[PDB]
Design a protein around this ligand. Structure first.
Ligand SMILES: NCCC(O)(P(=O)(O)O)P(=O)(O)O
Ligand SMILES: [Cl-]
Ligand SMILES: [Mg+2]
Ligand SMILES: [Mg+2]
Ligand SMILES: [Mg+2]
Length: 775
């Protein structure tokens, strides 16, 4: 550890060639995404054999005995898999293969072609249905499988196809279809758009086609489904239905996907993945262009996966809310009212979609601003939902196990967005992100703009490069520390890497080396000062030191005890080094501002030292007043935020994020730090807990701890709003302040009074700064 460990590190990723390579990857990714965000190559999604077979059913509008879209028949004939099924070869899902295969078999029979394909397809369906022994063998179900498959299978039965219609599993599916259809408000199908519109081809005996046009999408589709639209067309001859089918054929050529368009969801998924991989800083232009498009279509009623959906989609809406707010767009959590029954109700469609919607709702709820009760309500509901989902058999299907769904849900629930280490979350996501991830709707599908090898290649390389740069900085840090004189204060533990981690895990960009270096120096100094005032120093010694603090005179130190003479000299040097660097970056005088900051901090320590000497227990009000100042976060934060390469802070701009006595970023960070610290420790003078109990002699320790949290929770919401709020403060500065708070909140998370885990701190340093990602 310390000097020896850090100087033993020899990372290859520091060489310029690695960054040059990453820049090639960045250019390649910009070119890849260009059609999606700026061109007309939006909605890149794999073929749906199931839907393609429905489109193939449509007879020629000229009345001749052939398909209107004969290229779809040719596609089907040429794309059977080796086992006789149709679907995506890389991923096997039973329900997907069963549905697509029966769909293709029937249309080939309709047109009296592909006799060999039909024979092989029928064998696949029969063969595989007979392997289903019980419910737990069925695996994950494609959208509305229970509704559609019995219907499609009855079509086959009327043609007397050699399939096992009398299997228990078949009877069970009909039972499930009945239980789904029982909750159906049929009269409302025609009046209120609903998820069932995605699958009209499965409920043909129920739908009055003469009334169904009222809920058609503006593009002519029925909830973006080619199959459902093809069905309505064949029953109605509706011109707009045909226009939709034509538009999809024009786009894809000789097949159709199971959803179209997916313009909103795809854009959001692209952004979400780029952000989670930690590579977002390379794609500011593309992220803005993507989210600007989503925002244009953002409305009070929510959004669907495609901009023309006549009903909103919780998955896409919750994802949109979070990403838009995170990128400083003005959105309101009142959009979630669109998904309440009159509270929430999502849990009706297919399982992966429902789980995804709730994961997204859970994540969105954590970005709550003050007074947003609906998001507190959303958090509760989603948490309960996800905990229940963990106990469901569907969660442990072969398909879900292969994708580690249970693990993903568990990780989400144990993870607080506020109490996260940003660099570590990106590192962890690089280990979970799948270039070949397969999604489920009417069929299994992929979105190559979202899931691809280039994203991951860049994610791993970029992480390693940044880390190697930090490793060189840590050599500088430990080298400085060794020669600084600070190690002479043997009453204080040496922790330079812990303090470097506090800033570097959130403010990681290469250009902010000076910020990280100066922040670390000040944090090292402060830990000595803290131990001196609250432990080592006598009140009479501290009175002397505090007088020297007022004087700003090196010559005055002749009065101090030897250890204080040295301490004062180091303190004086660090303060003025930071100030010179700040003045250089900011182009204005800042020595006076820094000096006032330091004296307020240390005068705060001295007040505390007087209390200790007198065994005085403050009121909670006086404790918090003192604590916001004496905790030292304000002056530490200032020692980094004013020296960020290229980030100009006028006095006016600075006062927006730093202003003692006001609820701005540095003040809220100070309050959060003080109180989070207390909740985590305090059990291991007097803390906020103990002060509250003096104020309330009859209250229990339990009530006391609850009270401290009642102060913390609102503070965290304010911190979030202050961070994300639109203003003219350089965003890099606000992010630096916010990210230091997030890393602090990690150190103090799950406050039970027990104390901070030293082994976990070391583990965070190992993961973040020491161990690279394997390439
Ligand atoms: N900078 C915080 C230092 C403390 O939390 P610590 O207990 O010394 O870690 P304090 O109790 O002095 O406020
Ligand atoms: Cl996968
Ligand atoms: Mg202290
Ligand atoms: Mg202390
Ligand atoms: Mg403490």
């Amino acid at each position: 550890w310390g000097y020896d460990l850090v100087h033993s590190l020899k990372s290859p990723y520091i060489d310029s060639s690695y960054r040059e390579r990453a820049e090639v990857l960045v250019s390649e990714i910009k070119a890849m995404l260009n059609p999606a965000i700026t061109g007309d190559g939006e909605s890149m999604i794999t073929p749906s054999a199931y839907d393609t077979a429905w489109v193939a059913r449509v007879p020629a509008i000229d009345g001749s005995a052939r398909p209107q879209f004969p290229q779809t028949v040719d596609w089907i004939l040429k794309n059977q898999l080796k086992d006789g099924s149709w679907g995506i070869q890389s991923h096997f899902l039973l329900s997907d293969r069963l549905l697509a295969t029966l769909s293709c078999v029937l249309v080939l029979l309709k047109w009296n072609v592909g006799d060999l394909q039909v024979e092989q397809g029928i064998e696949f369906i029969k063969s595989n249905l007979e392997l289903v022994k019980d419910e737990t063998d069925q695996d994950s179900l494609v959208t509305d499988f229970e509704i559609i498959f019995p219907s499609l299978l009855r079509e086959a039965q009327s043609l007397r196809l050699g399939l096992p219609y009398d299997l228990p599993y078949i009877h069970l599916l009909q039972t499930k279809r009945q239980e789904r259809l029982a909750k159906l408000s049929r009269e409302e199908i025609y009046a209120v758009p609903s998820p069932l519109l995605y699958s009209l081809e499965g409920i043909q005996d129920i739908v009055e086609w003469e009334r169904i046009m009222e809920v058609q999408s503006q593009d002519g589709s029925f909830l973006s489904s080619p199959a459902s639209t093809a069905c309505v067309f064949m029953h109605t001859g509706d011109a707009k239905c045909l226009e939709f089918l034509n538009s999809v054929m024009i786009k894809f050529g000789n097949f159709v996907p199971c959803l179209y368009p997916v313009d909103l969801l795809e854009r959001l998924l692209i952004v979400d993945n780029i952000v989670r991989l930690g590579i977002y800083r390379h794609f500011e232009k593309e992220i803005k262009e993507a989210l600007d498009y989503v925002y244009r279509h953002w409305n009070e009623r929510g959004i669907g996966w495609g901009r023309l959906n006549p009903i909103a989609d919780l998955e896409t809406t919750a994802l949109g809310f979070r990403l838009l707010r995170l990128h400083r767009y003005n959105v309101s959590p009142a959009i979630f009212d669109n998904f309440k029954d009159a509270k929430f109700i999502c849990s009706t469609g297919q399982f992966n979609k429902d789980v995804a919607s709730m994961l997204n709702l859970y994540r969105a709820s954590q970005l709550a601003f003050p007074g947003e009760n609906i998001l507190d309500e959303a958090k509760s509901f989603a948490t309960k939902y996800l905990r229940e989902a963990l106990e469901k058999s569907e969660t442990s299907s072969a398909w879900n196990n292969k994708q580690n769904l249970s693990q993903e849900i568990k990780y989400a629930l144990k993870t607080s967005w506020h109490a996260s280490v940003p660099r570590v979350e990106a590192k962890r996501y690089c280990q979970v992100y799948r270039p070949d991830y397969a999604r489920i709707a009417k069929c299994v599908y992929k979105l190559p703009y979202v899931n691809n090898e280039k994203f991951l290649e860049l994610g791993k390389l970029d992480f390693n490069i940044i880390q190697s740069i930090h490793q060189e900085e840590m050599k500088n840090v430990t080298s400085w520390f060794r020669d600084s004189g600070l190690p002479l204060f043997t009453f204080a533990r040496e922790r330079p890497l812990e303090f470097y981690f506090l800033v570097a895990a959130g403010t990681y960009e290469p250009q902010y080396a000076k910020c990280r270096f100066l922040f670390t120096k000040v944090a090292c100094l402060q830990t000595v000062l803290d131990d001196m005032y609250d432990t080592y120093g006598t009140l009479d010694e501290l009175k002397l030191f505090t007088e020297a603090v007022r004087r700003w005179d090196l010559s005055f130190t002749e009065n101090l005890p030897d250890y204080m003479k040295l301490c004062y000299q180091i303190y004086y040097d660090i303060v003025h080094e930071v100030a010179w660097e700040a003045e250089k970056e900011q182009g204005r005088e800042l020595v006076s501002f820094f000096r006032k900051g330091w004296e307020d901090y240390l005068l705060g320590y001295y007040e505390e030292a007087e209390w200790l000497a007198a065994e005085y227990v403050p009121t909670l009000d006086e404790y918090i007043k003192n604590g916001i100042t004496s905790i030292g976060q304000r002056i530490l934060l200032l020692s980094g935020v004013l020296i960020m390469d290229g980030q100009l802070l006028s006095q006016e701009a600075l006062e927006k994020v730093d202003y003692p006595g006001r609820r701005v970023l540095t003040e809220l960070n100070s309050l959060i730090s003080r109180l989070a610290d207390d909740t985590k420790t305090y059990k291991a003078l007097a803390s906020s807990i103990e002060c509250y109990m003096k104020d309330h002699p009859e209250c229990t320790e339990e009530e006391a701890l609850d009270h401290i949290y009642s102060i913390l929770e609102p503070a965290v919401k304010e911190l979030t709003r202050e961070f994300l709020k639109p203003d003219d403060v350089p965003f890099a500065c606000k992010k630096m302040l916010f990210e230091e708070t997030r890393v602090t909140m990690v150190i103090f998370k799950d406050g039970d009074g027990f104390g901070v885990s030293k082994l976990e701190v070391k583990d965070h340093i190992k993961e973040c700064l020491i161990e690279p990602l394997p390439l």
